Design a protein around this ligand. Structure first.
Ligand SMILES: O=C(CCCc1ccccc1)N1CCOCC1
Ligand SMILES: O=C(CCCc1ccccc1)N1CCOCC1
Lengths: 265, 266
């Protein structure tokens, strides 16, 4: 992979692997999520991150995901090449946004798009805080100055508020616990695992007859290595809409909330 | 990736991804296992197997390849961002079955950083029964294997061919209630063979993982874990640190896997 001519975005090509595809022989939404994750880490390395700025390291601040939104039109098939272009943008004092554009390396057509909202958090106390002006100037030089949105639209799904699932849920998957493969290099649960846990409560018949088109996911708290999760789902709706909730199996502490949209094959 | 000059082995280069590494920033044994799995599929496609891996007789007989044993020995785990080259090849073991070997190398230095060997057997995809490789079903794949023996683990009396005992109750360490999610399944809805590796390692205490690097792992496959099954992972220290492992269904205690791991201090 490499940064583009202006140095304000990053591109990378990926050949789809055998173990990365589902029953329909096309990459899963978790493979896509993992691919988005890798091109973002590679874009941070290429711009000089050893990911913390000089002021973030001095103040023990880190980037944390607050929301992830993914919309897929076509899932790349096993053996195909998918090109991903990623870029970042300052959202003033709120935080940062990272966008992605998925393209077929052969046709050049857009096959998916994703957007994420990252916020500042003290690595030690776990407390969120606004982006300080000193930190902003250190990363602004790596972002396009003019707005460049993957989801530009007037009333797009990526900026819609998500409600809290009410008990009783229609469908549920209980006792979900992470294993060492679900952890990252700093021993925290990888953000993609929560996507897989949300989808576990979707009945298999829906997965067999529908393709996942849109997924919005809000991150409220992290799941510790020794935590047990409950995944809940209720149909809210040709298209099938769902409302999801991830909560700790014991106290019912909310970990995640989101929505999925599915279309018939 | 591509087949070598003779067409009797296959090579592929892999750049190590951020999410593929563990706490020490080097690829995990499951990332390596997944990499071995992909280069074997790519070697089968390049030699003429359709993406619908069976020969012309296996189709009209409903026979499929199943893993009976996996053995992996790693000297150095590739770091995040590094390039690892894998050379893979197959060999007929007469009517017992087939063997697939792998050699891992540093794309920069060229030195061997790991090696693995697997034993595959014939199985009716409907009745799950075990069969010997028939003569007609051998001549069809023998043309893709080197005729002379080429072993990744040649040494007489080596770890890859040692019999594994059954763990006796009570186990020293245990991880219970392990169930697969959709990410653990393959394209044909079966549990991917790498998931069982991760489940075996779940019973290893975290302090051992933090102070040691996994050097050798031998794993025998006895039964598949269905999508709706619950697994128990058991471990007992037998000793470098050596362990004996056992995977069994949470309910009836039906054995699904057994194996060993060998670990070195960092
Ligand atoms: O996307 C982010 C946050 C912003 C980092 C950034 C990179 C390049 C230009 C401008 C800003 N991260 C990369 C990997 O995930 C953790 C941090
Ligand atoms: O290796 C095998 C079975 C033998 C297939 C083979 C490929 C190339 C040369 C000779 C034989 N498998 C790996 C791919 O998935 C199915 C099992």
């Amino acid at each position: 992979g490499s940064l583009t001519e202006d140095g304000l975005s990053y591109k990378e090509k990926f050949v789809v692997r055998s173990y990365e595809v589902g029953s329909n022989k096309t990459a899963t939404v978790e493979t896509i999520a993992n691919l988005l994750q890798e091109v973002g880490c590679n874009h941070a390395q290429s711009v000089g991150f050893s990911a913390t700025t000089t002021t973030m390291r001095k103040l023990h601040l880190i980037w944390v995901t607050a929301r992830m939104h993914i919309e897929i039109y076509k899932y790349p098939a096993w053996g195909d090449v998918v090109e991903i272009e990623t870029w970042c943008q300052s959202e003033g004092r709120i935080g940062t946004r990272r966008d992605w554009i998925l393209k077929d390396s052969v046709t050049g057509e857009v096959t998916g798009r994703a957007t994420s909202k990252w916020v500042m958090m003290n690595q030690d106390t776990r407390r969120l805080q606004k982006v300080s002006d000193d930190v902003r100037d250190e990363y602004l030089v790596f972002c396009p100055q003019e707005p460049r949105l993957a989801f530009p639209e007037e009333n797009n799904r990526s900026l819609k508020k998500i409600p809290k699932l009410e008990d009783p849920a229609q469908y549920s998957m209980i006792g979900l616990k992470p294993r060492r493969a679900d952890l990252d290099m700093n021993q925290h649960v990888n953000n993609v695992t929560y996507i897989g846990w949300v989808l576990e409560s979707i009945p298999q018949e829906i997965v067999d007859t529908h393709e996942l088109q849109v997924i919005t996911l809000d991150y409220r708290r992290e799941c510790q290595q020794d935590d047990v999760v409950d995944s809940l789902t209720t149909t809210t709706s040709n298209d099938s809409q769902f409302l999801h909730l991830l909560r700790l199996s014991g106290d019912g502490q909310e970990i995640n909330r989101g929505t999925t949209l599915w279309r018939k094959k």
